């Protein structure tokens, strides 16, 4: 459902399977993060389900051994000479060695300034060892980390707990239509996108011959060219698009390794799963309460956060003794308004706006034998309709699906194809809907802050800064103190600086923070883009130095003072709050957990095979499960009759189920409960 879920699904180091250990057999200890994971396996990106600690993911810099034992590159400090030597080792190649601190006052002479450096001893023990004694030093930061984890600025300010949530959610983003690059990200995104294949590349240098939405010809400097045929509205493995938009120019020289098209969630060749939004985490009248979120409705009307959802219904007409299910517009007993957007050849018109229950494909079948009821006999004798002995096993959009129809992919036996023994028509009709967001849709930031939208009101009641500006996004504060996750606020403020720009004044000398704060970080202009390594980033003091010069975007407005906070005026009241209100720029994205997907309703559907009990699933009409652990509270309430209802007729009494149907088709109170089938099936089981 996104380029990441394509990539990071690979580079997965699973613990289960043949030769692997099953979950129940998989005890507590094995789930742990062994010291031997440093650099090998990502210590943070693990599933948070029952596989916490079992399923693992690669690091970034890792390597695959010819044997397949994990290999990680590292420098080796010899006599206090940390060598550029990229020496690959595995775990047992440490116990006769010593790995040192990764970021020390290394003079570039290969020595450590301080003797006592925090190294890892042979057994994995991490302590101080003299400068010249340890033998190995790490390669570099963001070596022990994966890629998806490497897209969280201020990971070092974020709880390892929540970091897990953020990393796993980055795999669940949905393909939007803009994919704004983070104003604040990490330098790995640009690398991590092209490597994902979801970004079209100029495999070979040479001039861009031409640019088009369907292809892009790169005329190589030597005679030949390279024609790139693009992939548009190709449904994803999870019912989404693989849209690959071009960001190139009709003549510009493209290099070996430069973009040809951005993908679903990329821009300028770096990962871009969402949008960059100004914040104020003030709690707004109990509609963003307890993980509920309120947004600026501009973003909805702009569709800044909105997702295209392709889907396919598969319609398979096979060979039968009834005959064959001739998909045409030969519908038994069909009205007029229902054929309006349908083409004669048995499907909808390609580009038919369709809805829930809407008939999509007429997969008409013969019906079979039955006693013609005398009433219907009189009817066909009275008004003059036909027997209509055909069982229309057509497709109607099942519960809660809609949207335009893309088209059809049809294979057929008369087409002389490889269909299996019987299936004479394989059809794949495709329906898309760009689900404009709504409450119940799960959104999330890059630091684990997540949740469904409680509500989104128009821009009218939006507090504004001293720039007269209503803000993008409003969240609840109370999640922040109790989740060690001021890190998203750290990125918030630094993104403010990266959106307004700055000029750290080296008026008389580089400012004290600015000195070991690298060069050209003293300079920045509004609406800019930056990165921050997971452990080696924009330290707290550095950011304090980034607030000093807070040169605005347009007006004369330095809102975040040198220490951090800003002032806001309510957009409802027009009346000021007692204290300054926080603001700044946050990356946000939409998660693939829509309330358009997770609702199931059922008065009465089909029933199980053995028992008369309902079935399970949203696909099948299914039915809800009422467990024993619900029965416990159910009696603790003392509500016996409702429980008899639950297990007797609401599940398993056939005739009563019809009785209650009779009850509330007669407009009468539901009468005395019957005795149910599965109970009698229980008896049969027991007997």
């Amino acid at each position: 459902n996104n380029p990441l879920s394509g990539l990071t699904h690979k580079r997965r180091l699973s613990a289960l399977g043949p030769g692997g250990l099953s979950r129940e057999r998989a005890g507590l200890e094995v789930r742990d993060v062994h010291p031997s994971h440093y650099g090998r396996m990502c210590p943070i990106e693990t599933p948070e389900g029952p596989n916490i600690g079992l399923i693992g993911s690669l690091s970034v810099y890792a390597r695959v051994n010819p044997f397949g034992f994990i290999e990680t590159p590292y420098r080796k400090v010899v006599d206090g000479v940390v060598s550029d030597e990229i020496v690959y080792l595995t775990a047992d190649e440490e116990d006769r060695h010593v790995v040192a601190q990764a970021n020390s006052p290394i003079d570039a002479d290969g020595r450590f300034v301080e003797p006592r450096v925090l190294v890892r001893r042979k057994a994995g023990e991490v302590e101080y060892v003299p400068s010249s004694e340890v033998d190995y030093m790490d390669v570099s930061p963001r070596q022990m980390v994966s890629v998806a984890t490497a897209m969280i600025p201020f990971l070092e300010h974020d709880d390892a707990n929540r970091a897990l949530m953020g990393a796993n959610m980055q795999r669940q983003a949905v393909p939007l239509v803009r994919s704004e690059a983070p104003l604040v990200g990490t330098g790995m995104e640009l690398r991590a996108a092209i490597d994902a294949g979801d970004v079209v590349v100029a495999e070979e240098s040479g001039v861009i011959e031409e640019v088009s939405a369907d292809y892009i010809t790169v005329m190589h400097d030597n005679g030949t060219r390279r024609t790139y045929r693009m992939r548009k509205f190709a449904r994803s493995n999870h019912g989404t698009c693989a849209n690959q938009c071009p960001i190139v120019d009709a003549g510009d020289r493209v290099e070996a390794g430069q973009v040809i098209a951005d993908g679903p969630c990329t821009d300028d060749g770096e990962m871009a799963l969402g949008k960059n939004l100004l914040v104020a985490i003030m709690p707004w009248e109990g509609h963003n309460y307890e993980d509920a979120i309120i947004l600026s409705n501009r973003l909805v009307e702009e569709d800044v956060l909105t997702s295209i959802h392709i889907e396919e219904h598969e319609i398979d007409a096979r060979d039968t003794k009834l005959g064959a299910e001739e998909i045409t517009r030969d519908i038994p007993n069909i009205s007029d308004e229902v054929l309006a957007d349908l083409d004669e050849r048995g499907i909808v018109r390609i580009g038919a706006e369709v809805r829930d229950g809407d008939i999509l494909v007429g997969k008409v079948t013969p019906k079979g034998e039955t006693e013609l009821t005398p009433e219907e006999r009189l009817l066909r004798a009275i008004f003059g309709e036909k027997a209509r002995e055909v069982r229309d096993t057509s497709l109607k959009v099942p519960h809660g699906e809609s949207g335009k129809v893309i088209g059809i992919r049809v294979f057929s036996r008369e087409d002389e194809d490889e269909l299996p023994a019987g299936v004479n028509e394989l059809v794949r009709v495709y329906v898309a809907q760009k689900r404009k967001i709504s409450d119940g849709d799960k959104l999330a930031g890059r630091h684990g802050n997540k949740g469904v939208i409680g509500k989104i009101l128009p821009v009218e009641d939006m507090p504004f800064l001293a720039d007269g500006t209503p803000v993008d996004i409003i969240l609840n504060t109370h999640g922040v103190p109790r989740r060690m996750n001021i890190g998203q606020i750290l990125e918030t403020h630094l993104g403010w600086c990266a959106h307004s720009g700055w000029k750290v004044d080296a008026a008389k000398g580089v400012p004290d923070w600015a000195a070991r704060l690298p060069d050209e970080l003293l300079e920045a202009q509004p609406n800019a883009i930056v990165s921050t390594p997971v452990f080696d980033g924009a330290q707290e003091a550095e950011l304090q130095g980034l607030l000093s010069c807070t040169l605005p975007n347009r007006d004369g407005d330095v809102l975040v003072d040198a220490d951090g906070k800003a002032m806001l005026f309510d957009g409802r009241s027009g009346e000021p709050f007692p204290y300054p209100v926080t603001v700044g720029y946050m990356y946000i994205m939409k998660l693939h957990h829509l309330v358009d997907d997770k609702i199931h309703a059922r008065s009465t559907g089909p029933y199980s095979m053995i028992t008369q009990q309902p079935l399970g699933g949203k696909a099948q009409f299914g039915g809800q499960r009422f467990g024993e652990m619900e029965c416990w509270a159910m009696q603790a309430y003392g509500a016996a009759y409702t429980l008899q209802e639950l297990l007797t007729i609401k599940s398993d009494d056939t005739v009563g189920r019809v009785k209650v149907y009779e009850a509330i088709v007669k407009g009468e109170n539901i009468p005395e409960p019957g005795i149910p089938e599965s109970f009698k099936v229980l008896l049969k089981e027991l007997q």
């Binding site: 970034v60 810099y61 590159p73 420098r75 550029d84 990229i86 970021n103 290394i106 390669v139 570099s140 930061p141 990200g185 330098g187 790995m188 640009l190 690398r191 493209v254 290099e255 070996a256 390794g257 430069q258 973009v259 300028d268 060749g269 770096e270 070991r516 704060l517 690298p518 050209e520 970080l521 920045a524 883009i529 930056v530 990165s531 921050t532 390594p533 080696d536 980033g537 924009a538 330290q539 550095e542």
Partner: peptide, 21 residues
């Protein structure tokens, strides 16, 4: 940087890389 098409994404890096990604 070290990429034929990347934009300038300035950062606060403290050390250089004996090897790339």
């Amino acid at each position: 940087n070290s990429v034929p098409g990347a934009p300038n994404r300035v950062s606060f890096a403290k050390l250089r890389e004996p090897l790339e990604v």
